[model samples]
Each structure stands twice: as structure tokens, then as C-alpha cells.
Target: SVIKPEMKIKLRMEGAVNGHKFVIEGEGIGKPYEGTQTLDLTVEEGAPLPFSYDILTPAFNRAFTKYPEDIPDYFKQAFPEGYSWERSMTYEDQGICIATSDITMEGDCFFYEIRFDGTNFPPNGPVMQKKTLKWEPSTEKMYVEDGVLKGDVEMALLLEGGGHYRCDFKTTYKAKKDVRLPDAHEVDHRIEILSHDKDYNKVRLYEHAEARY
Candidate 1:
């Protein structure tokens, strides 16, 4: 004599941090207990927010306890309310730092704890900083051909380790030469860094990064 009962489970994403709401139906596997049962579960803001990379740790520290209106653009998305449940930090160089954290939901309210791996600077004093290189097409090698805009620029930057290196940047704007040049603000730009082995069998860093916009 063998007995078996049917069972099914379904999951769906609902708002309020209940990422997956589970619904179960059907009967049990036992004989006398063979009866249909349906259940719906929704956890109260217990789900963790999706997180990757360690680039935002210090940003969070700067925004912590600050009012919502004061959060920086980069930190605003994750720390909407200027808080998080967990945080982790790392460093690439003395001035190059990264942070990773998880935001959790709890009921209608959210509570968070800070976790970090690298140095956390004072709210008003931050050691690590982001650097940017800018160029104007008119001042460098640039022109239009076949309805496409192309340009190349060479620049150098002083590194944290007291060394300076040059970067060759090339750009392509895919638009008709006759039409108005795409507004720099509206143009889509993509950037990449490439490295290769050199003539002496030594690995040389080529382009550090490309700036499209």
C-alpha cells in the first residue's frame, strides 16, 4: 500500500522588501493526514537589497546620520534614507578605497548596522578622492569623416604613488556629419582600459581608462 499527495509552491515578488512571497497548496503525504492545505507567506522587510562591489563604503560613512537631503548622488540610490543594515570596506591603494553594504527592510521601518574593512574617515575629512581628466575636441586631434565624428587626445595624470603616466584617448561619435553634432550632454559614451605585454616581456599598463562623455 502506497500513498502520495499533490503539492505545489509558487513565489512572486511583492513590494515592501518581501522579495519573494511563497504560496503553497495541495495535500500532505500521509494517509490520515491527507488533506488539502493552502498557505501564503510574506516576510516583513526581512529581505536584503541586491549588492555588488566595494566602491561605496566611504561614501556611506560620509552620509551616515545625515539628513536625506544631504546624501550625495552616488550614495543616494542605496542609502535613500541615509542608512544601511550592513557595510564592508576594502582598498586598492592608499587613496583608492571601496565599500560594500547590504540594505535590509524591516516592517514599515528600516534599521541598520555599519560594517567596514578599510579606514573610515571623519565626516568632514575624507582622504580618498576620485579624479577626472577632461579634454575638448577642438584643441586636440579631431575631425569628421563619412558622417562620423572621430577624435584622439593624449593626457597624463599624477598617481597616488608619485608616478605620472600618459593616456591616449580615442572617441567615435556615430552621427551624420551634416547634422548638428550630438550635444555632449546627450551623447552616449563608453570607456575601457587595456593592458598588454611589452617589447621586453614586461607587462605595461596601456590605457588606464577612457572617458566617453
Candidate 2:
């Protein structure tokens, strides 16, 4: 082996040996990652060979956690809690989410654990990313109404490295006027999404998530 096992063989390779065309696969060769990889290769019916290939490993470090933009407004409105929703999104392959939060709130802050990967379900797993985070108002004026909870929060998101990004986490809660329940508990009863005019019990976001950061 001209290229010693200890040597880091990046994208390019040269200095052929005997004559064997290796079938390589995994990590980054028609693969979808850019990290330094030691992929597994199967030996075909040949000798040693010309082991040179071109795979420009592009920068691929990304936030494994789902971004607010990654999800559509309608989906977020329909499912406020991210666990069940994140699962649905990931399972359908509609999008990717390696971590999720339940997103609980007080008058001032949204605090919770950044746990669960949606890989595990009821009898499966809620695989923990287990980072406790609390997003709070950076500015004095925060907004709160019926189902409409708004705040200018400094959201230090847990990305591949870290992110102390600033943004607004606006939440909405709207119930249908048609259901017409007689003073029902919010938990037991369910809410249906109606138009802005039709929904008497209104709480929904036009821009569910916003900010430059």
C-alpha cells in the first residue's frame, strides 16, 4: 500500500499498484457527505488498479436540527407541537428533523429540551439531543393575546456547532366557531382551522417565524 493506512486519503488518489478495480461506496463518492471518509470497497475479479477518482468534498456541516424555514406555515399552524409534527414530516420524507422540542411557554419565555429525533415512535425511540434551551424576549415589548403568542427572542439554536441566532418565535391558537362547544376545557376539545373572519377563537400566524438572523 503506497498510501499508508495512517495517511488521510482525501478526494484524490493516484500511484496505482497491481490491477484490481475496486467498487467503492459510502460517505462521499456519489455519496451525500463531505467529511473525510474511509469507505468500504468490494474487490471484483481483477488485480490491483488505477485508484484515482474525483470527489470534491464540499462543505456539508449543517444543523441536524430542523430550522423554522424548513417547515411550511400551514403544517406548523395545523400542528403546534413539534414532536408529532416532526415525526410526520420526517417519516413522510417530506423534510428532515434530527431533533425537536415540545415548545412550552410562560408569559415571558419559551423553554424546553431540544430532544427527540423522530426516528423512534410510541414503542420506539425519542432519541435525545437533550439540550435544554429557553428562548426569551430580547426586547421589552413582547406581544401576547388569545392563541397568539409573540416575542422577540434570542434563540440560541443547537446546530452542528452552535447558533445564538436572534429571531421571533410566534405561536398561534385558533378554534372554530362552528364546533360551538359550551364552555369546554381546551384540552379535551379540539380546534379546527377556519378562515381569519370565520374563526372566533383566533390565534394563528401570518408569518409564523420571522427575523433576519
In model 1, the runs with Cα more than 4 Å from the true position are 1-139, 176-213
Model 2: runs farther than 4 Å from truth? 1-97, 116-208, 211-213
Q: What is candidate 1's lDDT per residue for 1-213, written digit by digit as tens?
A: 011123222222222111222111111111111222222322223222221111221112111111122211112233223322222222223322222333332322222232223333322222223232221112224445554445444433434445443434343433211333322221112111122122111111111111122
Model 2 pairs whose backbones collide: 18-48, 19-47, 19-48, 20-47, 20-48, 20-49, 120-125, 173-203
The positional error of residue 43 in candidate 1, measured at the CA in angstroms, is 27
Error (Å) of candidate 2 at residue 3 is: 61
Clashes of each: 5, 8
Task: Give the C-alpha lDDT of model 1.
Answer: 0.25
The residue-by-residue lDDT of candidate 2 on 110-209, one tens digit each, is 2223222222222221112222122222221223344332222222222223543232222232321122111211111111111222211121111111
TM-score of 1: 0.21
Error of 2 at 78 (Å): 10
